[PDB]
RNA sequence: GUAGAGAUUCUGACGUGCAAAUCGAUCUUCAAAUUUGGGUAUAGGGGCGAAAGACUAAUCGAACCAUCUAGUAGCUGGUUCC
RNA sequence: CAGAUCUUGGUGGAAGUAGCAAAUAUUCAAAUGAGAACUUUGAAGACUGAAGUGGGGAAAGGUUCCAUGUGAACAGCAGUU
């Protein structure tokens, strides 16, 4: 299946970049039926699509 | 359609052909020359070995710049290659001839490749760009392939 | 103008790969019927190189009666096995082999020479010949008498015992060795009694003898004229390269001459280096192979950790001075000198004072494991 | 009999001794596949993504000299006459271990 | 000295190229006689020119387009069966 | 018509040859599919490093935007894109 449209919609709904969008690889069939922003929000509520956290950038060495 | 030759019995032979096949004419000719006169089972084994790089197709006529290998020793030559695209096209046509023989009810143990021939199909033209704003041909060389298999 | 000698020698042409690997004798020493029957060639394997220190006995020299250091090459020479005899008649078209007589039994090592896949073969190489040998024993005598009656050159067929050599190759090297001595009849008789028998290195060669080393040089592959012929590098500004010859020919003749340096093969060539002096013929059944009268330490001729890429020499060996053609573990041919030696250097007896047995796998500083033990004391893994 | 699991130690250093820096990790993957093919006589080799992470742990130029692999020959979901090798990584203190069998 | 604007050398790469002028290193200038967008004016024996006969749509010691024009050529090539 | 560096068109040897090498770099598993090195997902390793390979505009282009399908031609390799 192709999920390029779903990834674009998920990034817009989550207000993050496409690099932070995570989809469950075990729910490809269910994710592919979204086709809509309301369905994308339903996927986010169900936890199938989440926003990955920011990459680690600590200032411990800088402060020391 | 008319085939180039009938070097067999019409009641005990099978035919197959492919027109405007997007494969190199020179490579197809070398494969056709190599597989000519061999049994259908041994032709399938040889084509599989070429695909798996166990045996090589010798290049006799169109051999300019072709590299050398040890797998051409069995053919008495030094220049041989492994054209996978040509082998796949010949493999499909041989399978079609096998199906035609099965439909005609021929004995599928004595099937000898009697007549295999490759001809040059009309060329498809593309464009390549050279230095100083020059445009040059980028033609392809598709081939017509016909195969006749009979009984010994 | 600005004359200079030409680059390279035209005598070593063509600079192609040698058609052989063993290294053949192009000319055996002139036969003499007064000296007793003896061999004129031998085969060995290059085990490696080392260096020695010895007193220089040379009156008038600056370093007379003073120690000098010299590099030597070690060649493992286990005894060879004679399995055949070949007779050559002198025809107006050269030497022609008349017949070849083989021994009744041939070992697996020599039998492997006649096969490319000995294991897959049916091992039928001299079965009928052995049957003829055992049937009634008249054909062998008839052929031997034919070699005695006719023929002027007698050569025995002898093969190396590569089995007792650490080389992974199991196929043995077979070679014709000319037999010099008195009369063809004695040559054939000597071959007959030496059938299925071993000939040692010290029976063929002796200490302080000048011999020749024949072998194929180390392969170098294709190489440009700069390193193949030692030509001058072109200036840095040279467009399209600078490791070539600027002028490969002139107009009229409108052809490239054979004397112009060209890129091509630069190694794996047949050569024979002359005047190699035997410094030591050591045996494989004594623990003092590398021990001298000035160094009474019981050590054998093997560097610490073994010879690099060769192994351990447990057989007889030779200590030819200088370098020899070919890489390590290659089979080399030793030939009796064709010339007569009367110079001080050639006739000077050699008495070694010290033979280096330190590791050649690095900057070795210990000659023996005992010396390493004493210097280093106890280590962590040594004590426990 | 056919379904056997064994733990191996692969000396990656001697296989990557002359590889270009931009190809050492991909060549290590290929050497692992060839290693499994030679040992288990199976054309099909499947590499655990965790093992791929372990190979690529120190970048593309620095692959560990020795790796502890677990070669398990299994039957596929296809016709039961085809066998494949599944390769995994084993976490051990010192990888200088001999080949062992896993029950 | 960065951005920007240029192009000294390697007479480097390329030189049927990525490119009918480019690529790399190096180099010149970098707060003014600076660089530049858009609008507008100057048109071919004319314009414009810190001046090289330079630029004026890859065309410049007189642009391009069509016609006179199938211009003329003591010059070159060709000029068809027995 | 045998020529005119003739005109138009077609087709050769060179030739399966030169070549498809700037811009650091890809790997594992799964899904789809007849077919996966190029599609999608997950994981890992990297790059642009805010005078960006980010987000927008002016000129210019004109539907290239989006969804659903196709893989005949193009994407100088491939193609399910």
Swiss-Prot record, chain A:
General remark? There are 2 genes for eL19 in S.pombe.
Lineage, highest ranks first:
Eukaryota, Fungi, Dikarya, Ascomycota, Taphrinomycotina
**Highest taxon of the source?**
Eukaryota
> Its function?
Component of the ribosome, a large ribonucleoprotein complex responsible for the synthesis of proteins in the cell. The small ribosomal subunit (SSU) binds messenger RNAs (mRNAs) and translates the encoded message by selecting cognate aminoacyl-transfer RNA (tRNA) molecules. The large subunit (LSU) contains the ribosomal catalytic site termed the peptidyl transferase center (PTC), which catalyzes the formation of peptide bonds, thereby polymerizing the amino acids delivered by tRNAs into a polypeptide chain.
Q: What is this protein called?
A: Large ribosomal subunit protein eL19B
Q: Which residues of the full protein are shown?
A: 2 to 65 of 193
Q: In which compartments does the protein localize?
A: Cytoplasm
- Describe the subunit structure: Component of the large ribosomal subunit (LSU). Mature yeast ribosomes consist of a small (40S) and a large (60S) subunit. The 40S small subunit contains 1 molecule of ribosomal RNA (18S rRNA) and at least 33 different proteins. The large 60S subunit contains 3 rRNA molecules (25S, 5.8S and 5S rRNA) and at least 46 different proteins. eL19 lies in close proximity to the binding site for eukaryotic initiation factor eIF4G.
Q: Family per UniProt?
A: Belongs to the eukaryotic ribosomal protein eL19 family.
From Swiss-Prot, chain B:
- The stretch of residues making up the signal peptide is none
Q: Any idea which GO molecular function terms this record carries?
A: structural constituent of ribosome
What is the originating organism of this protein? Answer: Schizosaccharomyces pombe (strain 972 / ATCC 24843)
The protein in question is named: Large ribosomal subunit protein uL22A
Tell me a GO biological process for this protein.
cytoplasmic translation
Which gene holds the coding sequence for this protein?
rpl1701
What does the record's miscellaneous section state? There are 2 genes for uL22 in S.pombe.
Disulfide cysteine pairs (residue numbers): none
What function is annotated for this protein? Component of the ribosome, a large ribonucleoprotein complex responsible for the synthesis of proteins in the cell. The small ribosomal subunit (SSU) binds messenger RNAs (mRNAs) and translates the encoded message by selecting cognate aminoacyl-transfer RNA (tRNA) molecules. The large subunit (LSU) contains the ribosomal catalytic site termed the peptidyl transferase center (PTC), which catalyzes the formation of peptide bonds, thereby polymerizing the amino acids delivered by tRNAs into a polypeptide chain.
Question: Which cell locations does it reside in?
Answer: Cytoplasm
Sorted alphabetically, the Gene Ontology cellular component annotations on this record are: cytosol; cytosolic large ribosomal subunit; preribosome
Of which family is this protein a member?
Answer: Belongs to the universal ribosomal protein uL22 family.
Q: Which UniProt keywords apply?
A: Cytoplasm, Ribonucleoprotein, Ribosomal protein
Swiss-Prot record, chain C:
Query: Which interval of the chain is the signal sequence?
Result: none
Gene3D superfamilies for this protein? 3.30.1430.10, Ribosomal protein L3, domain 3, Translation factors
UniProt modified residues of type Phosphothreonine = 368
Q: Show the ranges annotated as biased composition (Basic and acidic residues).
A: 1-6
Pfam families tied to this protein: Ribosomal_L3 (PF00297)
Give the GO cellular component terms, alphabetically: cytosol; cytosolic large ribosomal subunit; preribosome
Q: Which domain of life is it from?
A: Eukaryota
PTM sites of type Phosphoserine: 9, 61, 136, 139, 203, 291, 351
Q: Where is this region: Disordered?
A: 1-30
Entry's Gene Ontology molecular function annotations: RNA binding; structural constituent of ribosome
Compartments annotated for it: namely:
Cytoplasm
Regions of compositional bias (Basic residues) in chain numbering: 14-27
Query: Which cysteine pairs are joined by S-S bonds?
Result: none
Q: Which GO terms describe its biological process?
A: cytoplasmic translation; translation
Which keywords accompany this UniProt record?
Cytoplasm, Phosphoprotein, Ribonucleoprotein, Ribosomal protein
Presence of the UniProt keyword Ribosomal protein in the record: yes
Q: Which family does it belong to?
A: Belongs to the universal ribosomal protein uL3 family.
Q: What else is known?
A: There are 2 genes for uL3 in S.pombe.
> Quaternary arrangement and interactors, per the entry?
Component of the large ribosomal subunit (LSU). Mature yeast ribosomes consist of a small (40S) and a large (60S) subunit. The 40S small subunit contains 1 molecule of ribosomal RNA (18S rRNA) and at least 33 different proteins. The large 60S subunit contains 3 rRNA molecules (25S, 5.8S and 5S rRNA) and at least 46 different proteins. uL3 forms together with ES39L one of the contact sites for the signal recognition particle that targets ribosomes to the endoplasmic reticulum membrane.
What is this protein called in UniProt? Large ribosomal subunit protein uL3A
Q: State the organism of origin.
A: Schizosaccharomyces pombe (strain 972 / ATCC 24843)
Traced from the root, the source organism's taxonomic lineage reads: Eukaryota, Fungi, Dikarya, Ascomycota, Taphrinomycotina
State the encoding gene. rpl301
From Swiss-Prot, chain D:
Q: Where in the cell is it found?
A: Cytoplasm
A Gene Ontology cellular-component term? cytosolic large ribosomal subunit
SUPFAM superfamilies membership: Ribosomal protein L31e (SSF54575)
What Pfam families is this protein classified in?
Ribosomal_L31e
Gene3D superfamilies named among the record's database cross-references: 3.10.440.10
Q: What is the lineage of its organism?
A: Eukaryota, Fungi, Dikarya, Ascomycota, Taphrinomycotina
Predominant cellular place of this UniProt entry's protein: cytoplasm
- Free-text function comment from the UniProt entry: Component of the ribosome, a large ribonucleoprotein complex responsible for the synthesis of proteins in the cell. The small ribosomal subunit (SSU) binds messenger RNAs (mRNAs) and translates the encoded message by selecting cognate aminoacyl-transfer RNA (tRNA) molecules. The large subunit (LSU) contains the ribosomal catalytic site termed the peptidyl transferase center (PTC), which catalyzes the formation of peptide bonds, thereby polymerizing the amino acids delivered by tRNAs into a polypeptide chain.
Protein name as annotated: Large ribosomal subunit protein eL31
GO terms, molecular function:
structural constituent of ribosome
Subunit record text: Component of the large ribosomal subunit (LSU). Mature yeast ribosomes consist of a small (40S) and a large (60S) subunit. The 40S small subunit contains 1 molecule of ribosomal RNA (18S rRNA) and at least 33 different proteins. The large 60S subunit contains 3 rRNA molecules (25S, 5.8S and 5S rRNA) and at least 46 different proteins.
Q: List the disulfide bonds.
A: none
